[PDB]
Amino acid sequence: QDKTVNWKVSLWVPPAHPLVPATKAWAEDIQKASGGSIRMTVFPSEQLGKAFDHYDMARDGIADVTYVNPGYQPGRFPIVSAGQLPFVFKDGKKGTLALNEWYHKYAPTEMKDTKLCFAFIHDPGALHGKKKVLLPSDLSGLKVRPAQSTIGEMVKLFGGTNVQASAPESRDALERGVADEITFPWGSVFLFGIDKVVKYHMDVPLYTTVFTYNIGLKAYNALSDAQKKIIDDHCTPEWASKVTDPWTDFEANGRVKMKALQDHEVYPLTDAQLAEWKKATKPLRDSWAEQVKKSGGDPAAVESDLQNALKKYDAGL
């Protein structure tokens, strides 16, 4: 038998979040593959550290595996931020596979101080809140809790202000009144109790959040070659889908559930209103491209690679 391995996996979502049982099942299959030599415990609810610090927790050995939202740290990961632009993805499952295939090309530039396991997205989210927002300018003067740095840029472009908060901190920000509006996926509105705090919901696949699962290099490099192979075999597109597809399904189910509640107003946009949003969100691409160039990348090449992946997987809106 190999030297026994005991890993800690850190998440910043609660136990009822679909990623938690799915990640336990991933760990269980690794234990089965390794004949017991690799064991893990999954720590939800920020027990091991705050949401925003999860990349550094993997980098620095606080946890062996972490769930990361790169977009909680503005400017840190300019390439992966291409997936954060409004109106990119139509579907969580195919979008996860497209993002993962594309980003594995660039993760060695941008995430070289961890091992990237896989990248993924959520089912496209929506704008939820206390006001019936139809056009970009309706965010002017509103306080918005953005999902990631690109949505934060969008809020400022439209004359709102941001409320920086992680998913588990968002209900409290809305309840205290410091946020009027939130970009969130639909099932998570229920999971975090936000359905009791906001009643308006714009029925548009506005954006998604990009995520990574990151493994510490010291943790990985302490494995035997047989153990490394088992981890690598659990970091493939197959496993990106197995871990994240239940989350996609949960979030899409949330939208259908919300649309049946008589105390909520889930409203469509007109073609004219949606075009103002598509047209109005376009400047975010130049901001993205400038950040990539400043960090030493070629945004035209990075963007064409992502567009090719979207087309391959039929993942693009």
Ligand X SMILES: O=C(O)Cc1ccc(O)cc1
**Whole-angstrom Cα distance, residue 2 to residue 304?**
44
One residue of 5, 9, 13, 119 binding ligand X per CB under 6 A: 13
Binding track over 38-77 against ligand X, x by CB under 6 A: -------------------------------x--------
User: According to the binding rule CB under 6 A, does residue 116 interact with ligand X?
Assistant: no
Residue number with CB closer to ligand X (212 or 227) = 212
Please give the residue whose beta carbon sits closest to ligand X in the complex.
147
User: According to the binding rule CB under 6 A, does residue 10 interact with ligand X?
Assistant: no
Sheet strand arrangement including 181-184: 161-162, 143-145, 181-184, 126-129, 200-202, 265-267
Q: Shortest Cβ distance from residue 258 to ligand X (Å)? A: 14
Helical H runs in the chain?
Answer: 19-33, 54-60, 92-110, 149-157, 167-175, 186-191, 217-221, 225-233, 237-259, 271-281, 283-294, 299-313
Query: Which residue bears the tokens 């871990």?
Result: 243
Residue number with CB closer to ligand X (63 or 189) = 189
User: According to the binding rule CB under 6 A, does residue 147 interact with ligand X?
Assistant: yes
User: According to the binding rule CB under 6 A, does residue 310 interact with ligand X?
Assistant: no
Amino acid at 295: S
Amino acid at 169: E
- Angle in degrees, 0-180, between the axes of helices 271-281 and 283-294, rounded to the nearest 10: 20
One residue of 55, 184, 213, 220 binding ligand X per CB under 6 A: 184
* DSSP-based three-state secondary structure for 304: helix
Residue number with CB closer to ligand X (85 or 219) = 85
Q: Are 205 and 183 in contact (CB under 8 A)?
A: no
Residue number with CB closer to ligand X (17 or 255) = 17
Binding track over 232-261 against ligand X, x by CB under 6 A: ------------------------------
* Interface region with ligand X, contact rule CB under 6 A, candidates 180-188, 238-246, 253-261, 262-270: 180-188
